[PDB]
């Protein structure tokens with residue numbers, strides 16, 4: 001199956017053109033590191049024919065894209081370990097369904113569907129908004145991870161030349177939800193940063209529709225106690241709500257009703273402001289993108305190449321559009337990749 | 353070059369009260385002024401380094417160094433001589449500290465911190481003038497992004513400028529100008545999110561960017577000066593001075609807590625005597641004053657808190673500022689040769705002259721009568737056998753042994769320092 005996939009179906013020419021950033025072969029592909037999972041690292045290819053032939057001969061389950069080096073990775077055995085220095089690589093983001101499992105009830109374990117894909121889609125929307133309006137990036141594409149995740153590949157030349165410090169700073173700017181535990185209040189800094197306020201504003205309309213109706217994770221009283229209650233700030237309010245405890249909507253309104261009943265006097269304004277802040281924090285915890293921090297920090301990190309086959313499900317890691325769903329991924333898009341690669345090439349020529 | 357040309361070039365060089373030190377100075381100065389100015393700037397820089405190594409706050413640092421500005425290298429003066437002092441001192445230290453990478457790092461760190469201070473006492477109008485002298489955004493572009501910029505900088509204004517009221521923050525934001533720069537040069541602010549970031553550009557927290565640029569330019573100029581130094585190795589006059597200057601480099605306790613029982617319970621007998629005499633007489637004599645001040649310095653009382661405590665214990669401010677403020681600051685080593693005086697140990701205390709009437713310093717185990725000491729022990733609930741033991745220790749001249757005994761009964765055994773007594777007593781509660 002993998003032999004036939006790499007022989008006839010895998011788009012080698014298009015991946016080569018995307019990675020080389022030039023129609024003619026250059027050092028962007030000759031010096032680019034390739035790792036093959038069967039774990040053999042430091043492979044490189046001089047042409048589309050060499051790429052296709054080596055992939056067909058080795059027959060790996062998947063292979064991963066590395067950074068651009070000063071010298072070919074295939075000749076590393078003839079070079080000192082300090083001689084191979086990383087120059088450029090596309091800025092990459094990794095998002096998975098694992099960190100949202102405490103907030104979904106349609107699927108259990110490693111299963112995914114279009115209902116729980118809304119978390120991933122909102123993550124893409126927020127990340128794209130950040131990269132476009134804030135970082136000004138234009139040539140970025142989102143690729144299905146194969147089972148339940150999405151990979152972002154920012155091919156902007158400025159993004160490609162970023163150092164590890166710049167990549168870490170970018171990730172810290174984007175990765176607002178640093179602590180993924182659901183048993184503790186986020187207590188995000190106030191006032192909100194414009195990026196954070198904008199992200200909350202975009203995530204607010206979908207919050208009710210997903211969480212309180214479609215997922216309904218807090219309908220279970222124990223689940224509510226474990227996740228929804230710790231998002232609050234007042235111990236008396238938490239105890240009163242626990243004693244009183246309904247679908248997620250009823251509990252959400254009970255929070256406001258009990259807070260109004262408990263907090264009275266001149267100090268009620270501070271309490272309602274704090275409750276609203278906690279509710280926004282919980283909305284962000286439920287809906288904000290939860291990136292994989294490791295893959296983005298360093299230029300030398302290796303990420304799974306596009307159009308790879310997932311070993312467990314057979315889904316091909318296709319690029320993701322606005323209407324993509326996990327079910328739409330075919331089992332063992334090219335034109336969309338053609339459009340993206342062509343736009344990247346014209347932008348590269350414009351930058352030149 | 354003539355005097356008029358020199359004055360014009362200088363007025364062009366210091367159109368702002370601060371300078372980036374770009375063009376080397378032009379003129380002739382004597383070896384006297386060379387050495388003196390280099391020593392002055394090195395003294396200020398060594399003081400900044402000593403403050404850094406103690407992790408002092410920024411505010412405390414400018415409080416210590418403002419008089420050193422008024423004394424050694426006065427700033428914010430229209431005198432050309434002082435400005436030339438600053439310029440030539442900076443370039444002389446540039447010459448001196450460029451030999452090794454460690455020296456370059458230390459020099460650029462201290463100089464950038466000095467730049468931070470100097471920009472701090474400069475006024476907002478003067479800060480704007482210096483910054484104008486890195487592209488500032490137009491008024492329309494600020495108005496378009498006013499909401500987002502205000503949201504970004506509100507917390508920074510509140511926490512740095514102490515503008516707690518929202519109206520003051522809004523008024524400051526209205527007059528505040530911004531600079532359009534890319535995030536690659538402002539990554540350190542981007543990570544902390546102190547700058548609004550749009551379309552790959554960061555809208556400036558300007559002091560951090562200015563200081564980073566100062567550090568980079570200063571390091572580059574230091575490297576270039578190290579390259580050019582072998583040509584200047586031919587002169588006999590400067591080389592010994594450069595070598596000499598290079599080798600020259602090489603609160604829980606507050607004014608009210610020391611009065612409380614919690615802290616006073618850890619005092620030794622002598623410090624209790626000093627404290628009580630202070631309370632009764634609202635004044636202490638020289639040896640007692642120095643003893644108590646040095647003990648308080650040893651236990652961690654700050655210079656400002658020491659000044660407040662000493663002023664409030666002496667229940668006019670004119671005579672205080674005239675006669676005791678300098679002594680109480682000099683005990684901390686802030687003037688003169690700046691001696692961070694070590695607190696007196698029991699040998700130093702016992703080497704002082706014996707106290708008389710009205711004198712409270714010394715050691716109670718030596719200067720008090722056995723009756724008064726015994727009564728003070730009964731006040732500490734000490735039994736008669738213990739009292740006899742400490743009196744036997746005192747009668748032999750082993751006052752430190754008696755104090756150690758008192759510590760053990762009231763609470764590496766031997767204690768020969770009141771500060772050691774206090775530290776061990778605090779440890780027993782920790």
Ligand code: SF4
Pocket residue numbers: 620621622623697698701702714715716717751752753755756768769770773
């Ligand atoms: S032995 Fe030392 S610490 Fe104890 S009372 Fe005498 S001088 Fe003070």
